[PDB]
Amino acid sequence: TNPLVPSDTVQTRHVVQHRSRSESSIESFFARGACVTIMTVDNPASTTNK
Amino acid sequence: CGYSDRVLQLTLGNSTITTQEAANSVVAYGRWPEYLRDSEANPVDQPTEPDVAACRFYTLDTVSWTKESRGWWWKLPDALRDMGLFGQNMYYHYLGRSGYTVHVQCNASKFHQGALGVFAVPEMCLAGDS
């Protein structure tokens, strides 16, 4: 993949960059509790045949 | 030597304003206009800076004050959209920033009365008719 940046093909000004890739780190991408299943249980009356 | 709060000369590009009856001048929020600093910059492309071709005194249409007059308003940069090379630069680029020197002119005579409040409002959102 050609590693170009804007200054390679256009006239650019000087910008002091402040943005970061903190939230797209592998930890950050997966750092959330996700629902993987719903289990169903019960507690019926002593009498019920099932 | 003679110098005074009331007597000023302003010069920008090919234009000069003189006044013999000023009440000093205001710099909004104490901040003089400035170009965008690299530490606060955001679009990465080389900016267009028109300098003297656009940063000069454009005079808009004269209005008339009468006993019936309730008030007048303008928005910036909108009022300057059709003004010389400023307007042209504005409409050819997606982004633009600009500061302004606003000079309101209204003379009369020692026997007239009245007072105009001139207000510069940041984000002057107005109410609609509905």
Side-chain angles (χ1 to χ4, degrees):
Chain A
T1 299
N2 196 17
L4 302 201
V5 293
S7 56
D8 292 324
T9 59
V10 302
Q11 282 192 231
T12 49
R13 68 164 283 158
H14 179 232
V15 183
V16 178
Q17 194 48 257
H18 304 309
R19 287 182 284 105
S20 93
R21 291 177 175 186
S22 56
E23 206 174 353
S24 56
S25 78
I26 301 309
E27 270 297 306
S28 301
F29 189 70
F30 290 104
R32 217 120 311 180
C35 185
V36 296
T37 196
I38 305 182
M39 299 171 85
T40 303
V41 295
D42 68 14
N43 188 21
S46 339
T47 62
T48 78
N49 48 59
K50 200 168 67 169
Chain B
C1 196
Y3 301 96
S4 151
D5 248 2
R6 305 167 164 278
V7 184
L8 316 183
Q9 187 181 308
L10 311 183
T11 304
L12 277 157
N14 63 1
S15 59
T16 287
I17 294 177
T18 65
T19 176
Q20 298 197 62
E21 275 175 90
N24 209 315
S25 51
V26 170
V27 185
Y29 301 126
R31 289 275 287 275
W32 206 268
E34 60 171 47
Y35 287 92
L36 186 54
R37 280 176 265 151
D38 305 335
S39 51
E40 299 188 353
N42 182 226
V44 301
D45 61 310
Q46 221 327 108
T48 303
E49 304 185 356
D51 190 58
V52 290
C55 302
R56 62 180 304 285
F57 287 116
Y58 299 103
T59 293
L60 324 188
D61 290 328
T62 309
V63 304
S64 189
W65 182 16
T66 75
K67 297 233 253 270
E68 280 79 76
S69 304
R70 310 303 296 219
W72 308 261
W73 60 268
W74 292 265
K75 299 302 186 63
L76 293 175
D78 183 58
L80 302 188
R81 71 185 189 210
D82 294 303
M83 292 295 156
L85 282 164
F86 175 78
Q88 285 304 295
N89 276 289
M90 178 175 123
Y91 283 122
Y92 265 101
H93 301 82
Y94 162 43
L95 306 168
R97 52 180 267 139
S98 185
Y100 307 86
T101 288
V102 178
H103 191 66
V104 186
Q105 296 132 105
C106 184
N107 58 285
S109 82
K110 310 280 199 266
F111 297 83
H112 292 64
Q113 298 174 161
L116 295 172
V118 183
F119 304 97
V121 188
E123 303 289 1
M124 195 171 88
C125 299
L126 303 171
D129 62 2
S130 176

mmCIF file with all atom_site columns, all heavy atoms in Angstrom, chain B residues 63-81:
data_model
loop_
_atom_site.group_PDB
_atom_site.id
_atom_site.type_symbol
_atom_site.label_atom_id
_atom_site.label_alt_id
_atom_site.label_comp_id
_atom_site.label_asym_id
_atom_site.label_entity_id
_atom_site.label_seq_id
_atom_site.pdbx_PDB_ins_code
_atom_site.Cartn_x
_atom_site.Cartn_y
_atom_site.Cartn_z
_atom_site.occupancy
_atom_site.B_iso_or_equiv
_atom_site.pdbx_formal_charge
_atom_site.auth_seq_id
_atom_site.auth_comp_id
_atom_site.auth_asym_id
_atom_site.auth_atom_id
_atom_site.pdbx_PDB_model_num
ATOM 1   N N   . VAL B 1 63 ? -28.286 53.696 5.561  1.00 0.00 ? 63 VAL B N   1
ATOM 2   C CA  . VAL B 1 63 ? -29.672 53.651 5.985  1.00 0.00 ? 63 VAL B CA  1
ATOM 3   C C   . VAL B 1 63 ? -30.109 54.987 6.582  1.00 0.00 ? 63 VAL B C   1
ATOM 4   O O   . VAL B 1 63 ? -29.317 55.876 6.872  1.00 0.00 ? 63 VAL B O   1
ATOM 5   C CB  . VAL B 1 63 ? -29.947 52.532 7.033  1.00 0.00 ? 63 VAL B CB  1
ATOM 6   C CG1 . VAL B 1 63 ? -29.493 51.234 6.428  1.00 0.00 ? 63 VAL B CG1 1
ATOM 7   C CG2 . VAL B 1 63 ? -29.271 52.793 8.376  1.00 0.00 ? 63 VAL B CG2 1
ATOM 8   N N   . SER B 1 64 ? -31.393 55.169 6.831  1.00 0.00 ? 64 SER B N   1
ATOM 9   C CA  . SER B 1 64 ? -31.890 56.441 7.355  1.00 0.00 ? 64 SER B CA  1
ATOM 10  C C   . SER B 1 64 ? -32.590 56.403 8.705  1.00 0.00 ? 64 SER B C   1
ATOM 11  O O   . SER B 1 64 ? -33.562 55.683 8.917  1.00 0.00 ? 64 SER B O   1
ATOM 12  C CB  . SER B 1 64 ? -32.842 57.038 6.357  1.00 0.00 ? 64 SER B CB  1
ATOM 13  O OG  . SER B 1 64 ? -33.174 58.349 6.735  1.00 0.00 ? 64 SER B OG  1
ATOM 14  N N   . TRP B 1 65 ? -32.075 57.157 9.667  1.00 0.00 ? 65 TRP B N   1
ATOM 15  C CA  . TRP B 1 65 ? -32.650 57.219 11.005 1.00 0.00 ? 65 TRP B CA  1
ATOM 16  C C   . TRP B 1 65 ? -33.685 58.320 11.147 1.00 0.00 ? 65 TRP B C   1
ATOM 17  O O   . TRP B 1 65 ? -33.452 59.511 10.910 1.00 0.00 ? 65 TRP B O   1
ATOM 18  C CB  . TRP B 1 65 ? -31.502 57.419 11.993 1.00 0.00 ? 65 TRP B CB  1
ATOM 19  C CG  . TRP B 1 65 ? -31.813 57.483 13.486 1.00 0.00 ? 65 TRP B CG  1
ATOM 20  C CD1 . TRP B 1 65 ? -32.990 57.067 14.044 1.00 0.00 ? 65 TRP B CD1 1
ATOM 21  C CD2 . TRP B 1 65 ? -30.946 57.972 14.418 1.00 0.00 ? 65 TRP B CD2 1
ATOM 22  N NE1 . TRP B 1 65 ? -32.874 57.291 15.331 1.00 0.00 ? 65 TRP B NE1 1
ATOM 23  C CE2 . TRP B 1 65 ? -31.683 57.826 15.601 1.00 0.00 ? 65 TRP B CE2 1
ATOM 24  C CE3 . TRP B 1 65 ? -29.661 58.493 14.439 1.00 0.00 ? 65 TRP B CE3 1
ATOM 25  C CZ2 . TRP B 1 65 ? -31.137 58.214 16.827 1.00 0.00 ? 65 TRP B CZ2 1
ATOM 26  C CZ3 . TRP B 1 65 ? -29.116 58.884 15.663 1.00 0.00 ? 65 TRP B CZ3 1
ATOM 27  C CH2 . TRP B 1 65 ? -29.852 58.748 16.850 1.00 0.00 ? 65 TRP B CH2 1
ATOM 28  N N   . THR B 1 66 ? -34.866 57.920 11.573 1.00 0.00 ? 66 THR B N   1
ATOM 29  C CA  . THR B 1 66 ? -36.009 58.832 11.745 1.00 0.00 ? 66 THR B CA  1
ATOM 30  C C   . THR B 1 66 ? -36.716 58.599 13.071 1.00 0.00 ? 66 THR B C   1
ATOM 31  O O   . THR B 1 66 ? -36.485 57.571 13.711 1.00 0.00 ? 66 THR B O   1
ATOM 32  C CB  . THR B 1 66 ? -37.080 58.650 10.654 1.00 0.00 ? 66 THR B CB  1
ATOM 33  O OG1 . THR B 1 66 ? -37.797 57.451 10.954 1.00 0.00 ? 66 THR B OG1 1
ATOM 34  C CG2 . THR B 1 66 ? -36.504 58.572 9.258  1.00 0.00 ? 66 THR B CG2 1
ATOM 35  N N   . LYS B 1 67 ? -37.627 59.458 13.529 1.00 0.00 ? 67 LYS B N   1
ATOM 36  C CA  . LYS B 1 67 ? -38.384 59.219 14.773 1.00 0.00 ? 67 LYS B CA  1
ATOM 37  C C   . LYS B 1 67 ? -39.148 57.888 14.757 1.00 0.00 ? 67 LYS B C   1
ATOM 38  O O   . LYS B 1 67 ? -39.474 57.356 15.812 1.00 0.00 ? 67 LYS B O   1
ATOM 39  C CB  . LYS B 1 67 ? -39.383 60.353 15.033 1.00 0.00 ? 67 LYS B CB  1
ATOM 40  C CG  . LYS B 1 67 ? -38.765 61.733 15.260 1.00 0.00 ? 67 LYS B CG  1
ATOM 41  C CD  . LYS B 1 67 ? -39.277 62.340 16.566 1.00 0.00 ? 67 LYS B CD  1
ATOM 42  C CE  . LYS B 1 67 ? -40.281 63.477 16.406 1.00 0.00 ? 67 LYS B CE  1
ATOM 43  N NZ  . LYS B 1 67 ? -39.622 64.776 16.337 1.00 0.00 ? 67 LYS B NZ  1
ATOM 44  N N   . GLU B 1 68 ? -39.444 57.291 13.610 1.00 0.00 ? 68 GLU B N   1
ATOM 45  C CA  . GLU B 1 68 ? -40.101 55.996 13.550 1.00 0.00 ? 68 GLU B CA  1
ATOM 46  C C   . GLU B 1 68 ? -39.185 54.775 13.642 1.00 0.00 ? 68 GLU B C   1
ATOM 47  O O   . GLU B 1 68 ? -39.629 53.641 13.812 1.00 0.00 ? 68 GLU B O   1
ATOM 48  C CB  . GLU B 1 68 ? -40.874 55.771 12.259 1.00 0.00 ? 68 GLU B CB  1
ATOM 49  C CG  . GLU B 1 68 ? -42.243 56.401 12.128 1.00 0.00 ? 68 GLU B CG  1
ATOM 50  C CD  . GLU B 1 68 ? -42.149 57.874 11.785 1.00 0.00 ? 68 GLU B CD  1
ATOM 51  O OE1 . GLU B 1 68 ? -41.867 58.195 10.620 1.00 0.00 ? 68 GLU B OE1 1
ATOM 52  O OE2 . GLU B 1 68 ? -42.365 58.706 12.682 1.00 0.00 ? 68 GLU B OE2 1
ATOM 53  N N   . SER B 1 69 ? -37.893 54.958 13.429 1.00 0.00 ? 69 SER B N   1
ATOM 54  C CA  . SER B 1 69 ? -36.944 53.862 13.391 1.00 0.00 ? 69 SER B CA  1
ATOM 55  C C   . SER B 1 69 ? -36.836 52.987 14.630 1.00 0.00 ? 69 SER B C   1
ATOM 56  O O   . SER B 1 69 ? -36.405 53.446 15.683 1.00 0.00 ? 69 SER B O   1
ATOM 57  C CB  . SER B 1 69 ? -35.553 54.370 13.095 1.00 0.00 ? 69 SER B CB  1
ATOM 58  O OG  . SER B 1 69 ? -35.484 55.132 11.878 1.00 0.00 ? 69 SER B OG  1
ATOM 59  N N   . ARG B 1 70 ? -37.205 51.726 14.557 1.00 0.00 ? 70 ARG B N   1
ATOM 60  C CA  . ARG B 1 70 ? -37.057 50.817 15.680 1.00 0.00 ? 70 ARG B CA  1
ATOM 61  C C   . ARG B 1 70 ? -35.689 50.133 15.794 1.00 0.00 ? 70 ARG B C   1
ATOM 62  O O   . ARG B 1 70 ? -35.301 49.671 16.867 1.00 0.00 ? 70 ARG B O   1
ATOM 63  C CB  . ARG B 1 70 ? -38.122 49.728 15.649 1.00 0.00 ? 70 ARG B CB  1
ATOM 64  C CG  . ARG B 1 70 ? -39.549 50.214 15.463 1.00 0.00 ? 70 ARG B CG  1
ATOM 65  C CD  . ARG B 1 70 ? -39.991 51.200 16.517 1.00 0.00 ? 70 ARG B CD  1
ATOM 66  N NE  . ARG B 1 70 ? -40.001 50.555 17.801 1.00 0.00 ? 70 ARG B NE  1
ATOM 67  C CZ  . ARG B 1 70 ? -40.946 50.776 18.706 1.00 0.00 ? 70 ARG B CZ  1
ATOM 68  N NH1 . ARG B 1 70 ? -41.939 51.615 18.463 1.00 0.00 ? 70 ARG B NH1 1
ATOM 69  N NH2 . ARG B 1 70 ? -40.865 50.092 19.863 1.00 0.00 ? 70 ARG B NH2 1
ATOM 70  N N   . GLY B 1 71 ? -34.932 50.021 14.717 1.00 0.00 ? 71 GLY B N   1
ATOM 71  C CA  . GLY B 1 71 ? -33.603 49.413 14.786 1.00 0.00 ? 71 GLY B CA  1
ATOM 72  C C   . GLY B 1 71 ? -33.142 48.650 13.540 1.00 0.00 ? 71 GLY B C   1
ATOM 73  O O   . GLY B 1 71 ? -33.947 48.248 12.704 1.00 0.00 ? 71 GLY B O   1
ATOM 74  N N   . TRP B 1 72 ? -31.842 48.428 13.386 1.00 0.00 ? 72 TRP B N   1
ATOM 75  C CA  . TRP B 1 72 ? -31.280 47.744 12.230 1.00 0.00 ? 72 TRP B CA  1
ATOM 76  C C   . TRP B 1 72 ? -30.328 46.619 12.599 1.00 0.00 ? 72 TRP B C   1
ATOM 77  O O   . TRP B 1 72 ? -29.657 46.672 13.631 1.00 0.00 ? 72 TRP B O   1
ATOM 78  C CB  . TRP B 1 72 ? -30.509 48.696 11.355 1.00 0.00 ? 72 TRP B CB  1
ATOM 79  C CG  . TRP B 1 72 ? -31.225 49.965 10.932 1.00 0.00 ? 72 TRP B CG  1
ATOM 80  C CD1 . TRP B 1 72 ? -31.813 50.080 9.707  1.00 0.00 ? 72 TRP B CD1 1
ATOM 81  C CD2 . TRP B 1 72 ? -31.333 51.104 11.680 1.00 0.00 ? 72 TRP B CD2 1
ATOM 82  N NE1 . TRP B 1 72 ? -32.291 51.299 9.662  1.00 0.00 ? 72 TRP B NE1 1
ATOM 83  C CE2 . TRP B 1 72 ? -32.027 51.948 10.806 1.00 0.00 ? 72 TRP B CE2 1
ATOM 84  C CE3 . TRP B 1 72 ? -30.939 51.545 12.937 1.00 0.00 ? 72 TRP B CE3 1
ATOM 85  C CZ2 . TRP B 1 72 ? -32.343 53.251 11.182 1.00 0.00 ? 72 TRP B CZ2 1
ATOM 86  C CZ3 . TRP B 1 72 ? -31.261 52.843 13.312 1.00 0.00 ? 72 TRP B CZ3 1
ATOM 87  C CH2 . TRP B 1 72 ? -31.963 53.689 12.442 1.00 0.00 ? 72 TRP B CH2 1
ATOM 88  N N   . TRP B 1 73 ? -30.222 45.562 11.807 1.00 0.00 ? 73 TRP B N   1
ATOM 89  C CA  . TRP B 1 73 ? -29.270 44.484 12.065 1.00 0.00 ? 73 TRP B CA  1
ATOM 90  C C   . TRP B 1 73 ? -28.602 43.932 10.813 1.00 0.00 ? 73 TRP B C   1
ATOM 91  O O   . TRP B 1 73 ? -29.148 43.931 9.718  1.00 0.00 ? 73 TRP B O   1
ATOM 92  C CB  . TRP B 1 73 ? -29.910 43.305 12.791 1.00 0.00 ? 73 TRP B CB  1
ATOM 93  C CG  . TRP B 1 73 ? -31.062 42.605 12.077 1.00 0.00 ? 73 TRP B CG  1
ATOM 94  C CD1 . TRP B 1 73 ? -32.346 43.002 12.310 1.00 0.00 ? 73 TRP B CD1 1
ATOM 95  C CD2 . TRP B 1 73 ? -30.984 41.559 11.194 1.00 0.00 ? 73 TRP B CD2 1
ATOM 96  N NE1 . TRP B 1 73 ? -33.092 42.213 11.584 1.00 0.00 ? 73 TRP B NE1 1
ATOM 97  C CE2 . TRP B 1 73 ? -32.335 41.344 10.904 1.00 0.00 ? 73 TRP B CE2 1
ATOM 98  C CE3 . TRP B 1 73 ? -29.999 40.757 10.597 1.00 0.00 ? 73 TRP B CE3 1
ATOM 99  C CZ2 . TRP B 1 73 ? -32.722 40.335 10.021 1.00 0.00 ? 73 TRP B CZ2 1
ATOM 100 C CZ3 . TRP B 1 73 ? -30.388 39.755 9.714  1.00 0.00 ? 73 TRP B CZ3 1
ATOM 101 C CH2 . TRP B 1 73 ? -31.742 39.543 9.427  1.00 0.00 ? 73 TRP B CH2 1
ATOM 102 N N   . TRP B 1 74 ? -27.389 43.444 10.980 1.00 0.00 ? 74 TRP B N   1
ATOM 103 C CA  . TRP B 1 74 ? -26.604 42.819 9.925  1.00 0.00 ? 74 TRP B CA  1
ATOM 104 C C   . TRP B 1 74 ? -25.872 41.586 10.428 1.00 0.00 ? 74 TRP B C   1
ATOM 105 O O   . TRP B 1 74 ? -25.584 41.462 11.627 1.00 0.00 ? 74 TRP B O   1
ATOM 106 C CB  . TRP B 1 74 ? -25.550 43.758 9.385  1.00 0.00 ? 74 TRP B CB  1
ATOM 107 C CG  . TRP B 1 74 ? -26.070 44.951 8.602  1.00 0.00 ? 74 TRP B CG  1
ATOM 108 C CD1 . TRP B 1 74 ? -26.165 44.921 7.227  1.00 0.00 ? 74 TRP B CD1 1
ATOM 109 C CD2 . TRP B 1 74 ? -26.472 46.146 9.134  1.00 0.00 ? 74 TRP B CD2 1
ATOM 110 N NE1 . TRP B 1 74 ? -26.628 46.094 6.896  1.00 0.00 ? 74 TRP B NE1 1
ATOM 111 C CE2 . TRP B 1 74 ? -26.813 46.864 7.974  1.00 0.00 ? 74 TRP B CE2 1
ATOM 112 C CE3 . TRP B 1 74 ? -26.588 46.720 10.402 1.00 0.00 ? 74 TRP B CE3 1
ATOM 113 C CZ2 . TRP B 1 74 ? -27.278 48.161 8.076  1.00 0.00 ? 74 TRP B CZ2 1
ATOM 114 C CZ3 . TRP B 1 74 ? -27.053 48.039 10.499 1.00 0.00 ? 74 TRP B CZ3 1
ATOM 115 C CH2 . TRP B 1 74 ? -27.407 48.747 9.347  1.00 0.00 ? 74 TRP B CH2 1
ATOM 116 N N   . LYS B 1 75 ? -25.546 40.628 9.591  1.00 0.00 ? 75 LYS B N   1
ATOM 117 C CA  . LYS B 1 75 ? -24.763 39.473 10.035 1.00 0.00 ? 75 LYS B CA  1
ATOM 118 C C   . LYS B 1 75 ? -23.422 39.412 9.317  1.00 0.00 ? 75 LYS B C   1
ATOM 119 O O   . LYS B 1 75 ? -23.288 39.829 8.159  1.00 0.00 ? 75 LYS B O   1
ATOM 120 C CB  . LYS B 1 75 ? -25.497 38.189 9.766  1.00 0.00 ? 75 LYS B CB  1
ATOM 121 C CG  . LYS B 1 75 ? -26.839 38.026 10.449 1.00 0.00 ? 75 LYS B CG  1
ATOM 122 C CD  . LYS B 1 75 ? -26.749 38.129 11.953 1.00 0.00 ? 75 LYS B CD  1
ATOM 123 C CE  . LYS B 1 75 ? -28.085 37.805 12.603 1.00 0.00 ? 75 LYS B CE  1
ATOM 124 N NZ  . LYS B 1 75 ? -28.471 36.428 12.318 1.00 0.00 ? 75 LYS B NZ  1
ATOM 125 N N   . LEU B 1 76 ? -22.379 38.930 9.966  1.00 0.00 ? 76 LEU B N   1
ATOM 126 C CA  . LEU B 1 76 ? -21.072 38.792 9.340  1.00 0.00 ? 76 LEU B CA  1
ATOM 127 C C   . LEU B 1 76 ? -20.627 37.344 9.289  1.00 0.00 ? 76 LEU B C   1
ATOM 128 O O   . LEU B 1 76 ? -20.803 36.617 10.284 1.00 0.00 ? 76 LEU B O   1
ATOM 129 C CB  . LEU B 1 76 ? -20.065 39.629 10.116 1.00 0.00 ? 76 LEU B CB  1
ATOM 130 C CG  . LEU B 1 76 ? -20.279 41.137 10.046 1.00 0.00 ? 76 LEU B CG  1
ATOM 131 C CD1 . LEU B 1 76 ? -19.293 41.840 10.956 1.00 0.00 ? 76 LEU B CD1 1
ATOM 132 C CD2 . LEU B 1 76 ? -20.106 41.613 8.610  1.00 0.00 ? 76 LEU B CD2 1
ATOM 133 N N   . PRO B 1 77 ? -20.018 36.858 8.201  1.00 0.00 ? 77 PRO B N   1
ATOM 134 C CA  . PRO B 1 77 ? -19.690 37.602 7.005  1.00 0.00 ? 77 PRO B CA  1
ATOM 135 C C   . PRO B 1 77 ? -20.774 37.932 5.985  1.00 0.00 ? 77 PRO B C   1
ATOM 136 O O   . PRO B 1 77 ? -20.483 38.659 5.031  1.00 0.00 ? 77 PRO B O   1
ATOM 137 C CB  . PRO B 1 77 ? -18.584 36.790 6.378  1.00 0.00 ? 77 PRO B CB  1
ATOM 138 C CG  . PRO B 1 77 ? -19.099 35.406 6.617  1.00 0.00 ? 77 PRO B CG  1
ATOM 139 C CD  . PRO B 1 77 ? -19.613 35.461 8.053  1.00 0.00 ? 77 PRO B CD  1
ATOM 140 N N   . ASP B 1 78 ? -22.008 37.500 6.151  1.00 0.00 ? 78 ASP B N   1
ATOM 141 C CA  . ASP B 1 78 ? -23.051 37.767 5.171  1.00 0.00 ? 78 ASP B CA  1
ATOM 142 C C   . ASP B 1 78 ? -23.148 39.156 4.535  1.00 0.00 ? 78 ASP B C   1
ATOM 143 O O   . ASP B 1 78 ? -23.215 39.278 3.316  1.00 0.00 ? 78 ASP B O   1
ATOM 144 C CB  . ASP B 1 78 ? -24.370 37.400 5.805  1.00 0.00 ? 78 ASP B CB  1
ATOM 145 C CG  . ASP B 1 78 ? -25.556 37.563 4.864  1.00 0.00 ? 78 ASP B CG  1
ATOM 146 O OD1 . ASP B 1 78 ? -25.575 36.951 3.814  1.00 0.00 ? 78 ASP B OD1 1
ATOM 147 O OD2 . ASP B 1 78 ? -26.452 38.339 5.212  1.00 0.00 ? 78 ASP B OD2 1
ATOM 148 N N   . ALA B 1 79 ? -23.129 40.233 5.312  1.00 0.00 ? 79 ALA B N   1
ATOM 149 C CA  . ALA B 1 79 ? -23.153 41.582 4.766  1.00 0.00 ? 79 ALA B CA  1
ATOM 150 C C   . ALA B 1 79 ? -22.065 41.878 3.755  1.00 0.00 ? 79 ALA B C   1
ATOM 151 O O   . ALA B 1 79 ? -22.250 42.615 2.783  1.00 0.00 ? 79 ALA B O   1
ATOM 152 C CB  . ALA B 1 79 ? -23.018 42.587 5.876  1.00 0.00 ? 79 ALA B CB  1
ATOM 153 N N   . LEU B 1 80 ? -20.893 41.203 3.894  1.00 0.00 ? 80 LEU B N   1
ATOM 154 C CA  . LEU B 1 80 ? -19.777 41.357 2.986  1.00 0.00 ? 80 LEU B CA  1
ATOM 155 C C   . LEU B 1 80 ? -19.708 40.341 1.846  1.00 0.00 ? 80 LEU B C   1
ATOM 156 O O   . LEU B 1 80 ? -18.835 40.446 0.985  1.00 0.00 ? 80 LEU B O   1
ATOM 157 C CB  . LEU B 1 80 ? -18.511 41.331 3.795  1.00 0.00 ? 80 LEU B CB  1
ATOM 158 C CG  . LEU B 1 80 ? -18.353 42.371 4.903  1.00 0.00 ? 80 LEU B CG  1
ATOM 159 C CD1 . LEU B 1 80 ? -16.949 42.282 5.442  1.00 0.00 ? 80 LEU B CD1 1
ATOM 160 C CD2 . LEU B 1 80 ? -18.576 43.767 4.374  1.00 0.00 ? 80 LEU B CD2 1
ATOM 161 N N   . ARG B 1 81 ? -20.636 39.401 1.730  1.00 0.00 ? 81 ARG B N   1
ATOM 162 C CA  . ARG B 1 81 ? -20.642 38.381 0.666  1.00 0.00 ? 81 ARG B CA  1
ATOM 163 C C   . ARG B 1 81 ? -20.481 38.856 -0.774 1.00 0.00 ? 81 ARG B C   1
ATOM 164 O O   . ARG B 1 81 ? -19.914 38.173 -1.634 1.00 0.00 ? 81 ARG B O   1
ATOM 165 C CB  . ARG B 1 81 ? -21.911 37.555 0.758  1.00 0.00 ? 81 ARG B CB  1
ATOM 166 C CG  . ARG B 1 81 ? -23.190 38.268 0.345  1.00 0.00 ? 81 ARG B CG  1
ATOM 167 C CD  . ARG B 1 81 ? -24.410 37.409 0.577  1.00 0.00 ? 81 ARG B CD  1
ATOM 168 N NE  . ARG B 1 81 ? -25.581 38.017 -0.021 1.00 0.00 ? 81 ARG B NE  1
ATOM 169 C CZ  . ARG B 1 81 ? -26.808 37.851 0.465  1.00 0.00 ? 81 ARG B CZ  1
ATOM 170 N NH1 . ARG B 1 81 ? -27.045 37.121 1.541  1.00 0.00 ? 81 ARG B NH1 1
ATOM 171 N NH2 . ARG B 1 81 ? -27.834 38.428 -0.140 1.00 0.00 ? 81 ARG B NH2 1
#
